[PDB]
Design a protein that fits this description.
alpha/beta, Aminopeptidase, 304 residues, binds zinc ion, 9 helices, monomer, binds ligand 578, 16% strand
Length: 304
């Protein structure tokens, strides 16, 4: 069975996407936006009070297989949306005015692999010509300074950038969806762990984005808000200087598509448990992250 306070395997998350939609058709629609290399269904949940010509925020989780708290957050977010709509004024306004496109797990094949074989797997599970080595790093696979820095051209490496930008079915599916909905998508949020950071462009170069001041102020306010709940301290800034250079990232790509609010979240912790964050921290991690996500949503909505 599914639990919001445990890590759930893909079979369970999939059944959950169907169940939560079936139980809340007036707040959620489910579509598949493509298949993974191994033929799993890439679900996208449109969360919001349905209506004509609404703006949108796009959020994905599960780019990287071992970052289990990421997957857990997208599920937590959806329950908060459906349970508090109509009761909590902010979420009610959010869902009335805009849609959240929530992609609960992008790299499903890798996620399944962390359950069945190797808990520390990161990449996709696609084959590579000429080698037995498996997988591409999805967050090096976007057309954003592709493979120019902080990425490897070797399929056997953890940061393999792929045979070409969008070579992976999963990243092509995500990019295709965003390109087809650029007019409506006002913010792009991509959830990773760990490090307790909010990052914004750029990661493929040390150059700063045109609205750097605004993004910094927004990130600063969001981390302050997150800390109000349990005292958890986040840092923030441009990807390249705040953590390390990493070309081909989805946040940089989305930004260069014209989505002016583009953020990578790095959730708990700072290395004590790393990727193996105990289930006993899921609730607190998700609740504080909610505050930051809602702060950003409120800001974006107020600036349309
Ligand atoms: C502990 C976190 C920082 C994660 N990093 C990570 O697992 O690094 C593994 C690694 C292994 C070998 C070489 C280089 C890196 P992740 O969430 O994967 O960091 C991402 C990424 O590497 O895709 C990240 C790092 C820097 C900037 C961005 C935003 N574009 C995103
Ligand atoms: Zn990651």
């Amino acid at each position: 069975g599914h639990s919001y306070e445990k890590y759930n395997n893909w079979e369970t998350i999939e059944a959950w996407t169907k169940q939560v939609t079936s139980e809340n058709p007036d707040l959620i629609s489910r579509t598949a936006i493509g298949t993974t290399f191994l033929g799993n269904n890439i679900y996208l949940l449109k969360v919001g009070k349905p209506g004509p010509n609404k703006p949108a925020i796009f959020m994905d989780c599960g780019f990287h297989a071992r970052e289990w708290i990421s997957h857990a957050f997208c599920q937590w977010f959806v329950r908060e949306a459906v349970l508090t709509y109509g009761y909590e004024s902010h979420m009610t306004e959010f869902l009335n005015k805009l849609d959240f496109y929530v992609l609960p797990v992008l790299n499903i094949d890798g996620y399944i692999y962390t359950w069945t074989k190797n808990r520390m797997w990161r990449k996709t599970r696609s084959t590579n010509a000429g080698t037995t080595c498996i997988g591409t790093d999805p967050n090096r696979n976007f057309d954003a300074g592709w493979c120019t820095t902080g990425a490897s051209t070797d399929p056997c490496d953890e940061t393999y950038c792929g045979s070409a930008a969008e070579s992976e079915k999963e990243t092509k599916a995500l990019a295709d969806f965003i390109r087809n909905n650029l007019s409506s998508i006002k913010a792009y949020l991509t959830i990773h762990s760990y490090s307790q950071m909010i990052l914004y462009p750029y990661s493929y170069d040390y150059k700063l984005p045109e609205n750097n001041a605004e993004l910094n102020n927004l990130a600063k306010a969001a981390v302050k808000e997150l800390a109000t709940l349990y005292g958890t301290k986040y840092t923030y800034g441009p990807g390249a200087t705040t953590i390390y250079p990493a070309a081909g990232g989805s946040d940089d790509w989305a930004y260069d598509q014209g989505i002016k609010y583009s953020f990578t979240f790095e959730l708990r912790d700072k290395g004590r448990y790393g990727f193996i964050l105990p289930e006993s921290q899921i609730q607190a991690t998700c609740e504080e992250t909610m505050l930051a996500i809602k702060y950003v949503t409120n800001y974006v909505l107020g600036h349309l």
